[PDB]
Amino acid sequence: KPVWAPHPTDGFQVGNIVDIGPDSLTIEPLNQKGKTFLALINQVFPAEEDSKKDVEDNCSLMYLNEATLLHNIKVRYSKDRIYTYVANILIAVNPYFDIPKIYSSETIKSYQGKSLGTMPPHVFAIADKAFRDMKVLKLSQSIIVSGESGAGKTENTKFVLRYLTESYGTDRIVEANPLLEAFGNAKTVRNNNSSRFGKFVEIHFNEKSSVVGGFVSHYLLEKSRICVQGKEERNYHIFYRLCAGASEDIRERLHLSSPDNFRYLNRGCTRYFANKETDKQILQNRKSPEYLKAGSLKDPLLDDHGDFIRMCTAMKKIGLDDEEKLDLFRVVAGVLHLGNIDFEEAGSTSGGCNLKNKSTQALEYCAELLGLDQDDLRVSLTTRVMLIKVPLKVEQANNARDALAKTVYSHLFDHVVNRVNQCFPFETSSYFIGVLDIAGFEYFEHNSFEQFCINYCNEKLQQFFNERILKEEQELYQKEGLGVNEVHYVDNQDCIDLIEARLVGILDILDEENRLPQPSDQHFTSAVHQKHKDHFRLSIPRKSKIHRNIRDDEGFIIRHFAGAVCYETTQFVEKNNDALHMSLESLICESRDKFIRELFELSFISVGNKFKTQLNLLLDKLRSTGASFIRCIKPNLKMTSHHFEGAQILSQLQCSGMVSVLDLMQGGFPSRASFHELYNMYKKYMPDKLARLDPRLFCKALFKALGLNEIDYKFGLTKVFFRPGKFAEFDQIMKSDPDHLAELVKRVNHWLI
Numbered sequence: 001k002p003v004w005a006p007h008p009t010d011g012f013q014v015g016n017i018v019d020i021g022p023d024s025l026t027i028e029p030l031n032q033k034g035k036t037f038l039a040l041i042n043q044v045f046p047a048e049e050d051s052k053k054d055v056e057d058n059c060s061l062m063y064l065n066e067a068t069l070l071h072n073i074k075v076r077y078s079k080d081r082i083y084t085y086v087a088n089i090l091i092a093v094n095p096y097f098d099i100p101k102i103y104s105s106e107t108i109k110s111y112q113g114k115s116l117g118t119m120p121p122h123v124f125a126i127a128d129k130a131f132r133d134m135k136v137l138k139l140s141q142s143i144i145v146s147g148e149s150g151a152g153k154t155e156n157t158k159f160v161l162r163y164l165t166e167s168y169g170t171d172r173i174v175e176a177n178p179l180l181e182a183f184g185n186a187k188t189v190r191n192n193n194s195s196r197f198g199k200f201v202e203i204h205f206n207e208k209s210s211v212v213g214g215f216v217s218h219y220l221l222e223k224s225r226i227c228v229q230g231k232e233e234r235n236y237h238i239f240y241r242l243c244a245g246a247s248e249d250i251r252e253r254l255h256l257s258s259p260d261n262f263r264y265l266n267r268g269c270t271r272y273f274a275n276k277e278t279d280k281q282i283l284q285n286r287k288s289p290e291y292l293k294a295g296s297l298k299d300p301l302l303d304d305h306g307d308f309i310r311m312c313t314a315m316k317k318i319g320l321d322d323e324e325k326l327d328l329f330r331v332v333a334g335v336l337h338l339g340n341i342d343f344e345e346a347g348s349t350s351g352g353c354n355l356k357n358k359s360t361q362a363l364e365y366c367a368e369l370l371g372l373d374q375d376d377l378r379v380s381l382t383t384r385v386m387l388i389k390v391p392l393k394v395e396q397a398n399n400a401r402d403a404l405a406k407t408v409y410s411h412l413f414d415h416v417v418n419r420v421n422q423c424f425p426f427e428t429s430s431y432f433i434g435v436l437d438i439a440g441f442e443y444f445e446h447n448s449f450e451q452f453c454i455n456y457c458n459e460k461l462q463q464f465f466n467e468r469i470l471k472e473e474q475e476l477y478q479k480e481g482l483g484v485n486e487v488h489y490v491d492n493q494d495c496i497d498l499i500e501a502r503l504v505g506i507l508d509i510l511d512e513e514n515r516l517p518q519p520s521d522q523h524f525t526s527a528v529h530q531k532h533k534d535h536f537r538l539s540i541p542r543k544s545k546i547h548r549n550i551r552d553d554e555g556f557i558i559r560h561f562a563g564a565v566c567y568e569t570t571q572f573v574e575k576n577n578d579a580l581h582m583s584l585e586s587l588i589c590e591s592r593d594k595f596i597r598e599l600f601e602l603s604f605i606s607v608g609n610k611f612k613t614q615l616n617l618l619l620d621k622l623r624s625t626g627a628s629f630i631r632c633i634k635p636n637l638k639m640t641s642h643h644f645e646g647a648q649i650l651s652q653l654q655c656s657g658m659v660s661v662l663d664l665m666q667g668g669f670p671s672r673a674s675f676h677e678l679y680n681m682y683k684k685y686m687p688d689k690l691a692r693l694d695p696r697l698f699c700k701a702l703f704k705a706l707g708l709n710e711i712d713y714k715f716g717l718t719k720v721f722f723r724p725g726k727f728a729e730f731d732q733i734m735k736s737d738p739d740h741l742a743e744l745v746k747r748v749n750h751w752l753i
């Protein structure tokens with residue numbers, strides 16, 4: 001009799017139906033006789049009879065729906081069980097604290113070779129299943145870790161990598177994380193350790209399914225962050241790790257000081273992540289006035305001083321010499337001093353500019369650290385060469401300085417990524433297991449080119465998810481005559497074409513703008529609207545529900561898979577160009593420093609189209625491998641433990657598409673094998689009476705002899721299909737070792753008598 005009915009903050013609440021009206025149900029909340037509220041008939045769901053129980057796989061629920069799913073993960077979360085299955089898909093709720101021993105070496109060992117369901121749900125079981133599928137099917141595998149910023153994608157990606165390398169190695173793949181995170185992660189409002197780049201990390205295996213090396217693909221490092229941040233945000237961790245942790249010798253050589261002294265850090269938060277202990281390890285001369293007044297930033301994982309130590313240890317472990325370490329730090333410090341170069345108006349009509357006299361020291365330090373001549377640097381930042389050397393206005397000089405800073409830092413990041421790939425190389429491999437960790441769909445009050453690229457990425461991945469989970473899965477069920485109720489989806493090719501089609505897509509129109517004599521963000525935006533007047537996915541910013549005052553040539557709205565996003569198109573042309581102007585390129589290419597020249601070993605390189613090419617290569621890998629999915633869930637917006645915000649979690653469950661596939665998964669068949677392959681594996685061990693049976697009939701005798709329930713599996717036209725929660729039963733049927741095969745044949749022989 002009790003049901004789940006809507007609740008504004010908990011998502012659902014328990015109640016009893018006490019009346020029915022047109023389109024409504026009257027609900028009495030539990031243990032509150034007399035009190036009532038109305039709910040739409042389709043927003044009321046059956047509840048599990050036992051409200052205290054929890055199940056490891058949501059498919060085991062008597063009534064699987066969005067409400068019972070929410071309650072089951074809630075009960076598990078109150079007991080620190082953050083991992084729950086939906087058949088072979090994993091739900092991971094961020095605990096926001098370290099749960100003791102769940103990632104231990106002992107826990108890792110306990111998951112090795114274990115079937116899904118034989119051990120409690122865990123990221124390790126997903127990793128082991130990808131490994132087992134890889135080895136048995138001789139097919140490379142992808143593990144996709146999805147969810148909102150702060151949901152736990154990066155942490156779960158590292159758990160998979162640690163599990164695989166520790167279990168199936170003979171390490172560097174794991175130790176390369178502090179390095180990438182130092183240069184590509186930053187404090188944002190939603191995540192103190194936010195990934196500002198996307199990654200696909202492959203672990204390569206030889207014929208014996210032993211680790212031989214790895215390969216990291218990196219995407220869309222956020223360049224805007226390099227120069228300015230909001231007051232609650234920080235630049236890349238490296239800057240603060242270096243300021244907090246560098247020895248006095250390095251501090252002096254790099255002319256470092258407290259973060260408030262650098263324009264590239266001082267618009268953001270200048271406080272370090274530290275605790276009572278690590279704060280005493282940070283020297284007084286590193287601490288900003290705001291750090292001395294407000295104290296440290298708190299986090300259970302991040303510690304700028306401790307992380308600096310751990311990163312240097314990781315650099316040593318991966319094979320980076322102290323010379324390369326110092327070369328990386330010199331570039332980082334050079335970028336900081338570059339940001340301190342200021343300009344003032346010059347010329348009777350303020351048509352030009354000069355370096356401010358107070359910027360003298362910053363110019364000297366920058367040029368020394370980057371191996372540049374101070375005059376060439378001064379000239380390149382304050383004039384532009386034309387087909388004549390003409391003065392730059394203050395705003396243009398600020399742009400030239402920032403363009404150089406962003407390019408040098410992005411090239412430094414590309415070098416670090418390439419350097420980690422060079423630390424675990426392999427000549428050949430038989431298969432890989434790849435883990436995808438890329439930011440999901442997002443929107444803010446102001447949406448720029450970075451959001452456009454990430455949301456574009458998510459449209460393409462959402463299509464891959466629909467194709468793998470819905471299209472291909474159901475086509476197999478249908479081809480096999482399984483009679484599974486069809487779950488449909490509306491394809492998003494029109495939204496993808498709008499962004500990426502040759503010539504007419506937004507990316508090609510943007511590149512067209514970058515190649516024009518006088519590039520303009522308004523001319524680009526007008527050309528988008530002028531080319532896609534009929535397109536339902538596109539509209540002017542005046543049609544939004546702040547966007548009322550945005551002009552038609554000042555933005556566009558894209559109706560995405562997860563909602564309409566209004567993009568402000570200012571800086572779109574600038575952000576789309578990955579190349580430095582020739583004057584700045586020449587300057588850095590001609591550095592006296594070999595390391596600097598090696599970073600750089602009409603000037604226009606399309607960011608949009610470079611990303612489209614990278615994403616297509618990633619999609620080629622995903623489409624050619626088996627796929628496993630981890631859905632990370634952020635429990636609240638406060639980074640706090642034991643605070644399950646029901647309505648916020650329900651919203652993620654709905655927006656992720658999880659709720660839409662519940663019936664398909666529960667009524668699905670994730671495990672399958674042909675009657676022919678099963679028959680052929682057992683054949684040599686069969687007596688005449690068994691071999692004479694047609695493959696399908698031997699399979700029936702095998703399953704009946706083992707006591708397999710007619711409910712547990714279903715026979716297709718050519719394959720046997722096993723249901724969720726039957727992974728252990730299917731793996732025992734599939735196990736190929738001679739002793740196991742001979743034993744099951746003896747069981748069938750005995751059963752037949």
Ligand SMILES: Nc1ncnc2c1ncn2[C@@H]1O[C@H](COP(=O)(O)OP(=O)(O)O)[C@@H](O)[C@H]1O
Nearest residue numbers: 094097098149150151152153154155191193301
């Ligand atoms: N299973 C976990 N155990 C402990 N802390 C976790 C776990 N998952 C996430 N966290 C915490 O949440 C923070 C955000 O997680 P993260 O993986 O960086 O999110 P995402 O990459 O999805 O934005 C982490 O820095 C860490 O403090």
Ligand SMILES: [Mg+2]
Nearest residue numbers: 153154194195
């Ligand atoms: Mg991340």
